[PDB]
Amino acid sequence: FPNITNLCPFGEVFNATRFASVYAWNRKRISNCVADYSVLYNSASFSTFKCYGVSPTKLNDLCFTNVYADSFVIRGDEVRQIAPGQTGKIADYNYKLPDDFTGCVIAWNSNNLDSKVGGNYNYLYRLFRKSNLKPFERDISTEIYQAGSTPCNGVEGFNCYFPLQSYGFQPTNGVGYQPYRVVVLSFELLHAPATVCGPK
Amino acid sequence: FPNITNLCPFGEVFNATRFASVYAWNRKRISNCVADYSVLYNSASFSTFKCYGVSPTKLNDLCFTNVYADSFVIRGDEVRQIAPGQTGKIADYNYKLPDDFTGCVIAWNSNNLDSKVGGNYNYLYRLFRKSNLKPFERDISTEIYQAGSTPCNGVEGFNCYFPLQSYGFQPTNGVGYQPYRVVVLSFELLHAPATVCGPKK
Amino acid sequence: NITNLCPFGEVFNATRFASVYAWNRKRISNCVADYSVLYNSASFSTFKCYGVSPTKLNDLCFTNVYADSFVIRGDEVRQIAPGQTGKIADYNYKLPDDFTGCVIAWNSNNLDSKVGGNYNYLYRLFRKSNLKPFERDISTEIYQAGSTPCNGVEGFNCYFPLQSYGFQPTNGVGYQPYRVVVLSFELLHAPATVCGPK
Amino acid sequence: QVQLVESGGGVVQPGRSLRLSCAASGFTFSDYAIHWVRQAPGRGLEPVALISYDGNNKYYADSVKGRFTISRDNSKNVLYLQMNSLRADDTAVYYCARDAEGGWVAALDYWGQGTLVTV
Amino acid sequence: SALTQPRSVSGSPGQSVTISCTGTSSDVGGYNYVSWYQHHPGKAPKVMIYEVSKRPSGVPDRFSGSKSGTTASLTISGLQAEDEADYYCCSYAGTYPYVFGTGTKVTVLG
Ligand SMILES: *[C@@H]1O[C@H](CO)[C@@H](O[C@@H]2O[C@H](CO)[C@@H](O[C@@H]3O[C@H](CO[C@H]4O[C@H](CO)[C@@H](O)[C@H](O)[C@@H]4O)[C@@H](O)[C@H](O[C@H]4O[C@H](CO)[C@@H](O)[C@H](O)[C@@H]4O)[C@@H]3O)[C@H](O)[C@H]2NC(C)=O)[C@H](O)[C@H]1NC(C)=O
Ligand SMILES: *[C@@H]1O[C@H](CO)[C@@H](O[C@@H]2O[C@H](CO)[C@@H](O)[C@H](O)[C@H]2NC(C)=O)[C@H](O)[C@H]1NC(C)=O
Ligand SMILES: *[C@@H]1O[C@H](CO)[C@@H](O)[C@H](O)[C@H]1NC(C)=O
């Protein structure tokens, strides 16, 4: 095994004060450290701890290489849409998971930090797009949407909608409309040496 | 595709102000029209859209022969019971789907438009039955069910109950007890002249 | 053939059903129970169950069956149910928020409620806190009401936490005695023991 | 250690204006909404104003709307309530309370001492 | 549109007491976000029950809350001299400015 011992920065990516909006889901690369997924699984805070391609209990043993973490905030009801082979508004125009996905998705309610009385409008999601997103692709550009058969250059007039729509998170905003923080860890097993995995 | 121009009446069945109770789920036959499922696929208002035997994206290219829209209203947490090979209290006494189902199920919350303060008792579902329902079979009989040796007749005695019972939907109900409107589109790929077809050309 | 024939008769018929606060607890296991007789009998005023349907009890098995019986007042028979609140639901007998059993309750005015007055069934009335599910309390210490520390002597702001029901034949159906027995089924890790007659 | 105080005010002639300042300490001030609640002598409590975390949104009671203004300065960690055209019915004790936001939903966690204002 | 509350209630120490709070559709009868506070004279009111039934940390278990139909009910068991203070019913309507009930002072015989 590798002789490195520095702990991976899971705390600051999971405990981060602010999570990026879905349409600009925050991407981070973790490597050259020692991770401990046992603590993540043990905690009961995570409402959903789904995993494809690897059983969560087996994580501490298998040694991966160059792991990636994608974090964002979404609506509670549509949390199901974050899964391979799942289609929908967010799954299409915002965040698409590849079918051959080998990783975990951890989703937990964050109604106590992201929902506020005035109405948290800092979280936005793309609503209109010409074509569905390719897997693991981010579409941050947004100028105008054309749905009126006219060259609607730069005016949000009739049949001219802003691609991004803001959420309306509030503390009393039901249960399915409450914000949920979602972080997906994507692994890989390439023809190259490992760089990050559990201790032994 | 055949030269047919029309719009399938999905609007009326999806926006109807009245949805029949589970035990009398309302069935409509749709044929000879050009359905555009995408319009309802992208509505983004359906809390559950599960298609069995057909990929929702591919639907626009399919060319069926008969469409059957079966609509009703079910409790929240019991929506999962509406699915092939499922068993429970509604999947076997009120609405049974065939094992080889080849349609789609669209379920969406309707708490605001159905439940009213003090409870709503206009929706009734069967609670006791002698035998489980066969696939796509509706029973409207209101015979008294005797759950005991005593052979009663027409009297709601100690061991004789009214077969139906009221949901009692009220706004102050957590998710799982709120009224959910459900529509089942049972397609059929029978080897007969296609009548309902997707818009291609 | 069928043998054992679990002794539900002793727990149901009985003769000196215990008071509510010191509610008894009989354990049934390693036997073949017969719930059909209980279900068919019409003497039981109430038989509403939780979870398992009453009819489908026979074709089932459990690790243990706990029969907890007592006598209460008719008007408050409703208090014996999950999520309910009240004197009995708080200080005498509280069912768990989730329940997987049945409750049987029937009037017993003839057996109990002597002409002069029973005064033999006592229910706890004062307590400092609530009761956890399936928790007895035979405590018999004077309950402090105000600030004065009751030195084990009944007096002002110092009440004995047991008030006699005092059943009488003419109290009226509302206040007449009601014998109640709640059956709870435990499907623990151990092999299933109690089963239907088949 | 959450702590809210208010400077308050004293006697004001009818039809004049007044200024009330509430300061908070012990928590991230620009993270929780704020409520101004009123209690007249011999009457029950009733909200009079509400300001969100950033001050973009304002809300007032129908019986007080159109004459009370509310603002918040996050940098200095203070909030202000301006009253105009004071009427005899406005004499009461004012509380500048904090909102649970995403904690105890629809609850006011911590309240200040309050200040009495007489016309 | 303040919710209606009983003016006053009474009860000897030890005995349970109940306080009612009536509203309408866009009130306790609608969203289940009722709350009960207490306001001791010359003191800062503190929340006693939130979200209909839940309780804050440190409050005695004696207090309990329920909501049926369009009416909420706060039940207190085993009163004491420390409970001589009015209780207040708050609900969240469609708009954010909350609607409070009316003063309800509990009296304990002495
Ligand atoms: C049941 O009843 C409801 C309400 O009566 C109907 O709701 C609409 O149904 C239509 C069906 O085609 C939906 O389709 C499209 O939605 C677009 C979304 O635009 C939204 O934002 C704009 C911003 O200005 C609003 O003005 C607009 O009202 C929407 O809120 C619309 O823009 C579309 O309008 C287009 O109509 C024609 C053909 O599509 C174009 O030529 C026009 O140029 C214009 O672009 C169109 O309406 C619509 O989203 C539904 N809206 C809502 C609020 O529900 C249901 O359709 C009806 N049936 C069913 C089965 O539900
Ligand atoms: C309590 O005792 C009575 C009387 O002994 C039992 O009454 C039985 O009732 C059933 C149904 O009506 C009859 O078939 C039996 O013949 C009765 N018993 C006798 C001895 O005649 C009653 O069953 C007893 N309690 C229970 C729970 O069985
Ligand atoms: C986030 O903060 C909580 C606070 O208790 C802590 O338990 C948790 O470990 C932190 N996150 C991670 C990934 O450790």
Alpha-carbon distance values, C19 to C138, C154, C181 (Å): 11, 22, 12
Q: Do A112 and D54 touch (CB under 8 A)?
A: no
Domains of chain D: 3-102+112-117 (2.60.40.10)
| A7, A12, A14, A40: residue to mutate for ligand 3 pocket, most atoms within 8 A of CB | A14
> Which of these, A134, A116, A126, lies nearest to A21 by C-alpha position?
A126
Cross-strand bridge partners of residue D50? D35, D59
Does one domain contain both B91 and B65?
A: yes
Q: Which residues contact D64 (CB under 8 A, 6 or more apart)?
A: D48, D49
Contacts of E41 (CB under 8 A, 6+ apart): E85
Is the same domain home to C28 and C125? Answer: no
- Mention every residue, 6+ apart, whose C-beta is less than 8 A from residue A64: A187, A188, A189, A194, A196, A197
Identify residue E78 by its one-letter amino acid code: G
Are A30 and A51 in the same domain? yes
Given a contact cutoff of 8 angstroms between Cβ atoms, the answer to whether C19 and C137 are in contact is: no
Distance CA D45, CA E103 (A): 8
Ligand 3 pocket residues where CB is under 6 Å: A 10-11, 14-15
Shared domain for C13 and C41, answered yes or no, is yes
Q: Provide CB contacts within 8 A for A13, sequence distance 6+.
A: A28, A30, A69, A71, A183
Q: Are residues B53 and B110 in the same domain?
A: yes
DSSP state of B23: G
Tokens 């609007």, residue located: B11
Confirm if E8 and E107 have CB atoms less than 8 A apart.
yes
Distance CA C129, CA C27 (A): 28
Cα(B176)–Cα(B81) distance, rounded to whole angstroms? 12
A174 touches chain D (CB under 8 A): no
Q: Could you tell me if C144 and C105 lie in one domain? A: no
The CA–CA distances, whole Å, from B115 to B167, B178, C134 equal: 10, 7, 37
Per-position DSSP letters for E2-58, written without gaps between them: PPB--SEEEE-TTS-EEEEEE--TTTTTSSS--EEEEE-TTS--EEEE-STT---SS
Full set of structural domains in chain E with CATH: 8-108 (2.60.40.10)
Cα–Cα dist A64/B166, whole Å: 55
Do residue C146 and residue E61 have CB atoms under 8 angstroms apart?
no
Resolution (A): 3.3
Q: Are D106 and D32 in contact (CB under 8 A)?
A: no
Running DSSP on this structure, what letter comes out for residue A186?
E
Residues A165 and A76 reside in one and the same domain: no
Interacting residues of B157 by C-beta distance below 8 A, sequence separation 6+: B150
Take residue B107 and report the two structure tokens written for it.
């379920």
CA distance B174 to A174: 9
The amino acid at E51: E
φ, ψ dihedrals at C26, nearest 5°: -100, 140
Rg, C-alpha atoms of chain A: 19
- Per-residue three-class SS string for C103-163: EEEEECCCCCCCCCCCCCCEECCCCCCCCCCCCCCCCCCCEECCCCCCCCCCECCEECCCE
CA of A95 to the centre of ligand 3 (A): 26
Number of structural domains (chain C) is 2
CB B169 within 8 A of CB B191: no
Ligand 1, atom 9, lies closest to the CA of B43
Give every CB contact of residue C126 below 8 A, 6+ residues apart in sequence.
C91, C143, C145, C159, C161, E14, E78
Looking at the fold, whether C195 and C174 belong to one and the same domain comes out as yes
Question: Which residues, in sequence order, are bridge partners of residue A50?
Answer: A105
Query: CA–CA separation, B38 vs D8, rounded Å?
Result: 61
Atom of ligand 1 nearest to the CA of B14: 60
Q: Which chains neighbour E (Cβ–Cβ under 8 Å, 3 or more pairs)? A: A, B, C, D
Q: Does residue A64 sit in the same domain as residue A8?
A: yes
Cross-chain residue pair C40–B148, CB shorter than 8 Å:
yes
Same domain, residue pair A9 and A105: yes
Decide if A149 touches D, using CB distance below 8 A. Answer: no
Contact C85 E75 (CB under 8 A): yes
Q: Whose CA is nearest to atom 33 of ligand 1?
A: A159
Query: 3-class DSSP state for residue B115?
Result: coil
Q: How far is the CA of A102 from the centre of ligand 1 (A)?
A: 39
Q: How far is CA A149 from CA A160, B42, C58, in A?
A: 10, 20, 69
**Nearest Cα residue in chain D from E43:** D113
Alpha-carbon radius of gyration of chain E: 13
Helix, strand, or coil (residue B162): coil
Neighbouring-strand partners of residue B74? B180
Residues C6, C40: one domain? Answer: yes
* Protein residue with its CA nearest to atom 22 in ligand 2: C13
Closest CA to A108 of A12, A10, A15: A15
Residues A21, A68, single domain; the answer is yes
SS3 at position A10: helix
Is E108 part of the contact surface with chain D (CB cutoff 8 Å)?
Answer: no
Amino acid at B179: P
User: Distance between CA atoms of A71 and D114, rounded to whole angstroms?
Assistant: 43
- Domain limits for position C72: 2-116+169-198
Tell how far the Cα of D53 is from the centroid of ligand 3, in angstroms. 25
Contacts of B175 in chain A (CB under 8 A): 175-176
Through-space distance between the first and last CA atoms of chain A, rounded to whole angstroms? 8
Tokens of C84: 């309910």
Task: Give the span between the Cα atoms of A189 and A53, in whole angstroms.
Answer: 11
Q: Give the residue from chain E lying closest to A173, CA to CA.
A: E31
Instruction: With CA atoms as reference, report the closest residue to D82 among D100, D99, D60.
Output: D60
